[PDB]
Design a binder for this molecule. Structure first.
Ligand SMILES: Nc1ncnc2c1ncn2[C@@H]1O[C@H](COP(=O)(O)OP(=O)(O)OP(=O)(O)O)[C@@H](O)[C@H]1O
Ligand SMILES: Nc1ncnc2c1ncn2[C@@H]1O[C@H](COP(=O)(O)OP(=O)(O)OP(=O)(O)O)[C@@H](O)[C@H]1O
Ligand SMILES: [Mg+2]
Ligand SMILES: [Mg+2]
Lengths: 842, 236, 398, 415, 58
């Protein structure tokens, strides 16, 4: 019950509210003045219970009607203020809003923080309740926001300000209202909220954050959000606005990492240095330094990688003297991938022709591509060795050499463009293998280029009726992955015409799946323009109509997180009815690629995939491991590996094959000794089937990629920056792997080399302002945010001290433990430039 | 099972009662001491006394003789007994031989007296460790409840021993003891590294060459603390 | 093989602030859960073979199925099986049974009427052991532990790093530590660290009290310990947490005490499981005890327990970290200076800091305040901290 | 002081409303329905079908299983206690049905009277209890699982510093077996039992593992948890059947690991004590030595607390030789360091004599822990070679960090 | 079993009167120690605060 002070205050409140019965002149001003005074005193204090509000439980009906009849001036406004404060505690949402709306304006700050928050919530509720039928109510709510937002800004309440500004769908005022000490908080809030908000508000929020960062001149972050938006005009605007040459070099490094090559005018000083950095010619050299820091110059051999000295030699000296072709292809992939990018191998460099001569047709192409893939990012160094094998006796393997070129020029660009020159006279080659090699090399060398000359040169291949189905598919995929995430009308129209003119009998083959691929590869991350795409694709008949629609639906929403598209895809998967299950497989890959945008969505996609596996039909069971591989590329999560190990022994050969490839992709480059042991056990168990052995050895090569210093992650910048080229590469490999026997185990091993398009390295090489390497002590650990929305860089814990260059595993980041240097980019990934601290004093 | 007598060796040759005697020192307030070219300084963590308690009787810096003083850490009564015995022995040495007692000799006597209480059963070892500073040449020695003495350029015993010594080794430089004020400031900083009250719980005694003791009043110590704070204010 | 049964956990939703970002992440979780529900509801709804297989096998075996113990395998289809009543029967082994699974002492499903071997029971796990397995991972994570960097690093190198990165251990040649005892004063973070590692680990986790592994009947104690460790072996990557090992880890000594000798037999079986004849495999053991000096040396010796992680009373930096973590969900005022609580020598542990925060919240609620102040924390310090009586000697030492 | 006022319902409503409620209600409801949804999924799947012995369809494919079920009949196992032999024409047979009862039955016409000898176990029909089939003699399952049948990979070169212990062990468990002629010529009966005792981790179980590794005879690793049975006298019967199985094998080896479990001291002042465990220990005592000579059964026993053993068991007629494992000397500790650092990726300049001298009173297990900790230190800072400083830090972390409280100021007492 | 019943009937309040009997200061080994009472002590201590967090139990 009450107290003496409480009872006296209750009596005073009751007297003040009861005096309003009649219309005496000295009632409305005195009583409302007293109520205003008490309410303001209680509300403008600590969060203590508002004692006047607790005591006040009257009815305002008489108060509302008298409001209607008495004092059209300020007294009704005082009454409105009082009833608004009273109804903030009660449930009078619309009335409580309109009391502040039409009553005494004064200011929302004069009431209290809680009153401001409640008014903000009610304003958001009304705005969501108000449609475009009338804009009369919108303007006063906007005026309320005009004062609500600065209140939150000045009282560290940026949460409510940002939320309200997202409800009203208007975010322009953040440009003119954000302070120096609060830009990071709101910017991080937006860059985290963009992933979960659906279309089209995510793009508006992204451009709002872009404008904020431009206003505060945080140019690297502006570049990050510009690549998030995937629009070149604002990237060019940021490039022009960058007046600091060190920031220019940093943004060139990040552009090269993302693979975005924008033409630079000669008006910008130091054009040559920026161009050569963006071409990423230096990377290999740094990689070499990397390797000579870890004493891993010496390349490995497949015999030691398989560890034959440990396998139980049940048949000794009688069952291993025969060298089958398929195991030779697997050993080529191993003695490639494992030793790749180190500039040397002990079996393909000194005994090349002898090795290649024990391969047949497809083995020739695979080994020729692996010869270039054993030396990465050295265009001249790679081609100096590739030319002789291009001059080979078996001119059919010439195409393979082109792959080598295309696999050597990957991740780099030259002014003279050796790849374009070398393949310009070979693209029009009538031989199917020659044209295939030419187009594949051109695509791999020019991933993400979007250069009009190469696209125009690739156009006539689609209209060539002579060109075979697999030539058409490889051409379509190369065109798509040269024009990743651009919605190029030229390529879209060309592929649409090619598929429209294609016959059903010729469409029934597996390679026709690669026709939507490039089309889909033209529309990565842009789901707005795909209504016309689906309308155009609706002309073709089912089932391939549904197949193409599903594939373009995946490609449109790559990482979008649109749960409605995932619901449609899950409905497709759950429909229990050969080619009919292709739709379900593509939809499963769609759930994977949409959910990999967000960590939460991905981890729930894990549970959905488990449910699909334990309760799905054979086609879904085959499809899921590819999805699991897509979800966690180069992220050896133990639960995923355990599920894949459980299903590697399944009685369905396709399911086991897909599970093995999922081991290879998920644990790629992590050098996981547990994964290596499990793969050795799988090789021992599957020692009889050539296909299982081939794919398990491929998985071992993938997991020993670069001796553990290479990753296939399509994500960068704390996994927030997507990579269109890498996403394209994994998409091609996975959709080809939807049919392992006909494509992977058939005539199309070269498709595996598309993963090298996604081949991106991990280091911590630190450069000075002049780009010389600089050893800096670095604190490396997990980025587990021990705070909420404090704006912290996840507050790296699990500390370990390192000297650069350093190797960072997936999910573990780094920070500068020394204040002597300041990084231009606060995200310590890849090559960075540290400016000497001017604030530090000796 | 081998720690209930002073004359029993442990199976690994440990005199456990002697080792236990050092915990009494470990329970005492920190006493720091350094030697300079012309001065020997020694500060003491002077823990706050009760409101009604007279602090005159609570003395940790005691002068064994006009040329040598001593600050203990450990049991107070054992410290009183040891200090009285040291004074008597120094006077007796001055009586037998004309020249005054050297700080090394008085430290040797104190160490031998402490040892002779650890050799016999039915005689509790002294639970104090002492810092003895004097001129003969400025010399600083430290005793031990075990009965071992050592010569130091700088110690600190008592509650803060590892921390204050850790501060001391990378602070005792040639220029640090170049000036008498510099040496006293070094002692003040070393004591402030442990005594986290400032001024009110710091008592420093300085003995200059061929001079007498001078307990620093809580205004000169306040001035030195202010100077140290001003010097450390260069961080900003 | 029977790979690990890792506990399931929902993704962490951060920030923990009551903002729209938390709403969006939680609604994404709800979306995906509803997707799973829709799929799992329409799966069996659209299900239109093996039914003949079931109608034959189940009819042949019939219900109920008795559970007996295999004793002898006489022929390829005849076995001497002992029923639970201890009566042996020479019964037949039906065709639909894997002859390689039958081993002496195995649990075998028999027909109710003719007791013929109709199948083999695989698990036959003691209910007191299957309850030790953790199904719901605890919510406490490594981000909820203030300070304790050395202890967390040691425990990660022991039980976490070998699972994720065995490459280092295999390359250098070390066998990773397979036993850790978390010892220290109570309320320092031992059980909290066990909760955190259980949350983080991808391996199966078994939680034991060090006293539920003790049974009434004479031989069921060591048998239960053996069953628990065998279950840990089954799910190969395993972590066996035995809180309060003091209950059984006490030092061996000679007395009549007919129950104490069984106590010592149980602890002897435990140490045999830890390191005795035959290898232990890839199962780690985490042990916690307030008093370690009272433990038997043969239990905490290296090889059985490789690491002894000390949990001291938190220092100033650690205490400040605890206060920052445990008031993160609070709404602190501007007049609050947590430092005064962190300083002084109250010898307050992490649990003490948690209680201080809770009591400060209660003090604020007493004044009808949802935001705490410095005065509330000061009152809570004296209100809660009154734990020890004297713990100190008199003014002997100067 | 001012008493705390109660919290009225209006106050509760205000505190739970006058604050964050824009998203608090929605967040809480979403969390609650998330928990309910998780419960729904778990319930709706909720099977995890238990594995049962269902063979592959091609394995059985037998419609005659029902014919076997109905035609063949179950038989209860019972040992023929006695042959009555009334007139050698209606002989009668007294059988004992385990615990059910005892009966006087006759054989079925299928079997011959000469094929059913006294004392063997036979199958009887459940209705007329008539003998139907002779059975092989009972072999306890757990007793046959007590055998090792899988030699561990611990050789004798992995036990350093115990040369005398190894030689005395091989003198009792290996030499009298491989070359018995070296003893009968001198008329010496070699000891038939060895008690391995010493500090924990000194290498008793390691030496037992080596013995089992190169035994070449029947090795039985007795489990101390199985001699301890729920029912009265079952542990004694366990010992009897174990010794009988050992006697069936030619010159078997038995290793009672951790003998303190069932080798306590007999007593009666405790008003009952164990009794059953004491009875099992007494039967083991009887089997070891006494009437009914044990035979060629050399017995291995290990315990790192031997003072609690029964003096009857400790008597040198059951455990004749008492091999003691002591803390290794400097040379032995160097040997252990070299053994345990053999496979490590360490430097070639490591002075292992220094490390051995730095661990005065340390068992071999502590040396192994020191090596592992040196590797861990070399891993923490990611060096691929473990240097001498890493080993010194490991020695400090393992030995000195937990040895005693003799701090450096207290360690200044020695020079 | 007491704590499992309290959880199954949650919310619940457990009143443990005269906790000196089981609850007193823990002893070392040796024949003097009660041991089993300390075992019940440790089980109760973990039950009310251990690896598994009690909900709505006071
Ligand atoms: N370092 C710490 N960081 C954060 N919270 C801590 C820390 N130490 C203790 N706590 C808090 O104290 C609570 C109780 O501590 P905990 O359960 O870890 O006890 P303990 O150390 O295992 O003690 P006992 O000897 O009783 O088993 C934890 O739930 C946690 O919230
Ligand atoms: N001489 C040695 N050489 C090498 N390793 C040794 C040696 N002595 C002991 N060890 C190591 O000690 C480890 C554990 O010792 P062990 O299992 O023999 O203990 P125990 O003394 O029998 O103890 P318990 O009292 O538990 O029976 C072994 O794994 C082994 O690596
Ligand atoms: Mg605990
Ligand atoms: Mg042992």
């Amino acid at each position: 019950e009450l107290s003496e002070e409480d009872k006296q205050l209750q009596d005073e409140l009751e007297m003040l509210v009861e005096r309003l019965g009649e219309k005496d002149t000295s009632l409305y001003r005195p009583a409302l003045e007293e109520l205003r005074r008490q309410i303001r005193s209680s509300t403008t204090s600590m969060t203590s219970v508002p004692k006047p509000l607790k005591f006040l439980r009257p009815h305002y009906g008489k108060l509302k009607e008298i409001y209607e009849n008495m004092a059209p001036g300020e007294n009704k406004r005082f009454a409105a203020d009082i009833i608004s404060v009273l109804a903030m505690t009660m449930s009078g949402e619309r009335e409580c809003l309109k009391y502040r709306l039409v009553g005494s304006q004064e200011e929302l700050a004069s009431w209290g923080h809680e009153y401001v928050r409640h008014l903000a919530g009610e304003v958001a509720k009304e705005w969501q309740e108000l449609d475009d039928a009338e804009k009369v109510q919108r303007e006063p709510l906007l005026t309320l926001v005009k004062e609500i937002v600065p209140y939150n800004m000045a009282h560290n309440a940026e949460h409510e300000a940002c939320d309200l500004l997202m409800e009203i769908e208007q975010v322009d005022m953040l440009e003119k209202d954000i302070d120096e000490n609060a830009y990071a908080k709101v910017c991080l809030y937006l860059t985290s909220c963009v992933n979960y908000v659906p279309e089209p508000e995510n793009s508006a929020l992204l451009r709002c954050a872009l404008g904020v960062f431009r206003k505060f001149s945080r140019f690297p972050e502006a570049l990050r959000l510009a690549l998030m938006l995937n629009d070149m005009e604002l990237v060019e605007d940021i490039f022009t606005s960058c007046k600091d040459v060190v920031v220019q070099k940093q943004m060139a490094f990040m552009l090269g990492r993302h693979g975005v090559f924008l033409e630079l005018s000669e008006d910008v000083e130091e054009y040559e240095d920026l161009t050569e950095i963006m071409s990423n010619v230096q990377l290999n050299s740094n990689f070499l330094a990397l390797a000579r820091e870890l004493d891993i110059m010496e390349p490995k051999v497949p015999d030691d990688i398989y560890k034959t000295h440990l396998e139980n030699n049940r048949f000794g000296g009688s069952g291993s003297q025969v060298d089958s072709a398929r195991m030779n292809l697997a050993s080529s992939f191993v003695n490639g991938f494992v030793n790749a990018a180190f500039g040397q191998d002990k079996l393909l460099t000194d005994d090349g022709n002898k090795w290649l001569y024990k391969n047949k047709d497809h083995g020739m192409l695979s080994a020729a591509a692996s010869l270039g893939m054993i030396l990465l990012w050295d265009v001249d160094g790679g081609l100096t060795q590739i030319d002789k094998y291009l001059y080979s006796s078996e001119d059919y393997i010439k195409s393979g050499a082109l792959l080598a070129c295309g696999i050597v020029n990957s991740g780099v660009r030259n002014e003279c463009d050796p790849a374009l020159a070398l393949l310009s006279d070979y693209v029009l080659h009538n031989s199917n293998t020659m044209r295939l090699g030419s187009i594949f090399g051109l695509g791999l060398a020019y991933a993400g280029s979007n250069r009009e000359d190469v696209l125009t040169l690739l156009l006539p291949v689609m209209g060539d009726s002579k060109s075979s189905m697999e030539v058409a598919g490889v051409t379509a995929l190369a065109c798509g992955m040269i024009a990743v995430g651009s919605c190029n009308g030229d390529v879209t129209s060309t592929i649409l015409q090619t598929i429209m003119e294609k016959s059903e009998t010729e469409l029934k083959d597996t390679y026709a799946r690669w026709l939507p691929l490039g089309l889909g590869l033209n529309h990565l991350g842009k789901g707005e323009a795909i209504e016309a795409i689906l309308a155009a694709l609706e002309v073709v008949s089912e089932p391939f109509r549904s197949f193409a629609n599903t594939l373009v639906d995946v490609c449109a929403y790559a990482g979008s997180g649109n749960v409605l598209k995932v619901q449609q895809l899950l409905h497709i998967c759950s429909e229990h009815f050969a080619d009919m299950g292709a739709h379900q497989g593509v939809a499963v890959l769609g759930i994977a690629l949409i959910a990999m945008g967000e960590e939460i969505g991905a981890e729930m996609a894990l549970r959905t995939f488990g449910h699909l596996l334990r309760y799905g039909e054979p086609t879904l069971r085959r499809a899921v491991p590819l999805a699991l591989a897509l979800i966690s590329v180069s992220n050896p999560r133990l639960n995923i590996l355990d599920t894949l190990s459980k299903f590697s022994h399944d009685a369905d050969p396709e399911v086991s094959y897909n599970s093995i490839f999922a081991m290879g992709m998920v644990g790629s480059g992590t050098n996981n000794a547990r994964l290596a042991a499990m793969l050795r056990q799988l090789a021992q168990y599957h020692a009889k089937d050539p296909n299982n052995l081939f794919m398990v050895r491929l998985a071992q090569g993938l997991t020993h990629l670069g001796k553990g210093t290479l990753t296939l992650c399509p994500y960068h910048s704390d996994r927030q920056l997507m990579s269109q080229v890498a996403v394209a590469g994994l998409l091609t490999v996975l959709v080809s792997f939807l049919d392992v026997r006909n494509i992977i185990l058939g005539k199309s091993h070269y498709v595996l080399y598309g993963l090298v398009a996604a081949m991106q390295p991990r280091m911590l090489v630190t450069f000075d302002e002049e780009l010389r390497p600089l050893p800096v002590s670095v604190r490396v650990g997990q980025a587990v945010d021990v705070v909420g929305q404090a704006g912290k860089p996840k507050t790296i814990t699990g500390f370990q001290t390192h000297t650069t260059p350093v190797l960072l595993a997936h999910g573990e980041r780094a920070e500068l433990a020394t204040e002597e240097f300041l990084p231009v980019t606060p995200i310590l990934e890849g090559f960075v430039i540290l400016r000497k601290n001017p604030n530090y004093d000796l | 099972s081998y720690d209930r007598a002073i004359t029993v060796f442990s199976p690994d040759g440990h005199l456990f009662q002697v080792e236990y005697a050092q915990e009494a020192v470990k329970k005492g307030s920190t006493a720091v001491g350094v030697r300079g070219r012309d001065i020997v300084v020694l500060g003491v963590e002077k823990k706050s006394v009760a409101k009604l308690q007279d602090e005159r009787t609570v003395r940790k810096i005691c002068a064994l003789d006009d040329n040598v003083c001593m600050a203990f850490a450990g049991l107070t009564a054992d410290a009183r007994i040891v200090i009285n015995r040291a004074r008597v022995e120094c006077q007796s040495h001055r009586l037998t031989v004309e020249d005054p007692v050297t700080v090394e000799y008085i430290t040797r006597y104190i160490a031998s007296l402490k040892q002779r209480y650890t050799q016999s059963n039915g005689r509790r070892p002294f639970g104090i460790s002492a810092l003895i500073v004097g001129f003969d040449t400025p010399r600083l020695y430290q005793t031990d409840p075990s009965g071992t003495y050592h010569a130091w350029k700088a110690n600190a015993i008592g509650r803060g021993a590892k921390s204050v010594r850790e501060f001391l080794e990378k602070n005792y430089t040639d220029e640090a003891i170049e000036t008498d004020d510099l040496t006293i400031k070094l002692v003040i900083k070393a004591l402030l590294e442990v005594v986290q009250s400032g001024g009110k719980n710091i008592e420093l005694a300085v003995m200059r060459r061929d001079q007498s003791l001078k307990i620093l009043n809580p205004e000169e110590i306040e001035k030195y603390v202010a100077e140290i704070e001003k010097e450390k204010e260069e961080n900003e | 093989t029977k790979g690990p049964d890792a506990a399931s956990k929902l993704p962490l939703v951060t920030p923990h602030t009551q903002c729209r970002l938390k709403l969006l992440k939680l609604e994404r979780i709800k979306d995906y859960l509803l997707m799973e529900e829709e799929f799992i509801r329409n799966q069996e709804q659209m299900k239109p073979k093996q039914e003949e297989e079931r109608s034959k096998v189940d009819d042949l075996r019939g219900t109920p199925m008795s559970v007996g113990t295999l004793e002898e395998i006489i022929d390829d289809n005849h076995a001497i099986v002992s029923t639970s009543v201890g009566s042996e029967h020479y019964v037949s082994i039906l065709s639909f049974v894997d002859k390689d699974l039958l081993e002496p002492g195995c649990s075998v499903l028999l027909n109710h009427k003719v007791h013929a071997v109709i199948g083999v029971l695989m698990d036959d796990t003691d209910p007191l052991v299957t309850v030790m397995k953790v199904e719901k991972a605890p919510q406490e994570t490594y981000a909820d532990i203030g300070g304790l960097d050395n202890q967390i690093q040691e425990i990660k190198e022991s039980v976490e790093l070998p699972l994720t990165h065995p490459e280092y251990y295999e390359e250098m040649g070390i066998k990773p530590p397979k036993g850790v005892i978390l010892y220290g004063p109570p309320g320092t973070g031992k059980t909290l660290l066990a909760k955190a590692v259980a949350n983080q680990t991808s391996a199966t986790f078994l939680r034991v009290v060090g006293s539920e592994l003790i049974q009434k009947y004479l031989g069921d104690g060591p048998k239960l310990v053996r069953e628990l460790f065998r279950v840990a072996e089954e799910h190969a990557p395993s972590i066996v947490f035995i809180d309060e090992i003091d209950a059984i880890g006490t030092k061996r000594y000679d007395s009549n005490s007919g129950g104490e000798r069984e106590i010592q037999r149980t602890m002897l079986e435990l140490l045999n499981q830890l390191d005795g004849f035959d290898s232990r495999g890839d199962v780690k053991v985490i042990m916690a005890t307030n008093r370690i000096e009272t433990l038997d040396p043969a239990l905490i010796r290296p090889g059985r327990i490789d690491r002894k992680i000390e949990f001291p009373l938190p220092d100033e930096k650690t205490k400040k970290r605890i206060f920052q973590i445990h008031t993160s969900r609070m709404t602190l005022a501007d007049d609050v200076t947590l430092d005064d609580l962190i300083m002084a020598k109250d010898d307050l542990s992490g649990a003490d800091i948690k209680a201080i925060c809770t009591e400060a919240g209660l003090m604020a609620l007493r004044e009808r305040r949802m935001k705490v102040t410095n005065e509330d924390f000061k009152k809570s310090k004296e209100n809660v901290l009154y734990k020890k009586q004297e713990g100190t000697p008199e003014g002997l030492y100067l | 002081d001012k008493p705390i006022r109660a919290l009225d319902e209006g106050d509760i409503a205000l505190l739970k409303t006058y604050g964050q409620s824009t998203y608090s209600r929605q967040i809480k409801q979403v969390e609650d329905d998330i928990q309910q949804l998780l419960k729904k999924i778990n319930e709706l799947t909720g099977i995890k079908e238990s594995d049962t012995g269902l063979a592959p369809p091609a394995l059985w494919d037998l419609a005659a299983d029902k014919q076997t079920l109905q035609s063949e009949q179950p038989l209860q196992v019972a040992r023929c206690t006695k042959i009555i032999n009334a007139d050698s024409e209606d002989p009668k047979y007294i059988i004992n049905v385990k615990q059910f009862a005892k009966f006087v039955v006759d054989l079925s016409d299928q079997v011959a009277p000469t094929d059913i000898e006294e004392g063997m176990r036979v199958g009887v029909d459940r209705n007329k209890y008539q003998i139907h089939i002779p059975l092989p003699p009972k072999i306890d399952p757990t007793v046959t699982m007590m055998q090792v049948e899988e030699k561990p990979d611990v050789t004798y070169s992995d036990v350093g510093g115990c040369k005398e212990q190894i030689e005395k062990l091989r003198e009792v468990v290996e030499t009298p077996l491989l070359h018995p002629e070296r003893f009968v010529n001198l008329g010496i009966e070699p000891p038939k039992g060895v008690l391995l005792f010493g500090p924990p981790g000194t290498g008793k179980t390691l030496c037992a593992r080596a013995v089992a590794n190169r035994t070449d005879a029947c090795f039985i690793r007795v489990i101390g948890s199985e001699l301890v049975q729920k029912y009265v006298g079952e542990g004694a019967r366990m010992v009897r059947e174990l010794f009988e199985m050992a006697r069936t094998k030619k010159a078997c080896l038995i290793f009672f690991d951790e003998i303190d479990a069932i080798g306590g001291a007999r007593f009666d002042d405790g008003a009952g004590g164990d009794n059953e465990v004491q009875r099992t220990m007494l039967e083991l005592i009887n089997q070891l030595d006494g009437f009914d000579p044990r035979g060629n059964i050399k017995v291995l026993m290990a315990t790192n607390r031997p003072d609690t053993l029964d003096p009857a068991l400790m008597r040198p007629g059951r455990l004749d030789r008492k091999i003691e494992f002591s803390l290794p000397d400097l040379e032995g500790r160097t040997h252990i360091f070299k053994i345990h650092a053999r496979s490590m990726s360490v430097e070639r300049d490591i002075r292992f004599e220094l490390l051995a001298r730095l661990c005065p009173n340390s068992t071999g297990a502590e040396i192994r822990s020191v090596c592992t900790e040196a590797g861990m230190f070399a891993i923490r800072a990611r060096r691929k070679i473990a240097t001498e400083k890493d080993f010194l830090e490991a020695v400090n972390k393992v030995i000195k960090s937990y040895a005693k409280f003799s701090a450096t100021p207290r360690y200044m007492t020695y020079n | 079993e007491l704590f499992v019943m309290a959880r199954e009937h949650a919310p619940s309040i457990i009143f443990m009167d005269e906790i000196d009997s089981i609850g007193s200061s823990r002893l070392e080994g040796g024949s003097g120690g009660d041991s089993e009472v300390q075992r019940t002590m440790l089980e109760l201590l973990n039950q009310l605060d251990g690896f598994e967090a009690t909900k709505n139990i006071k």
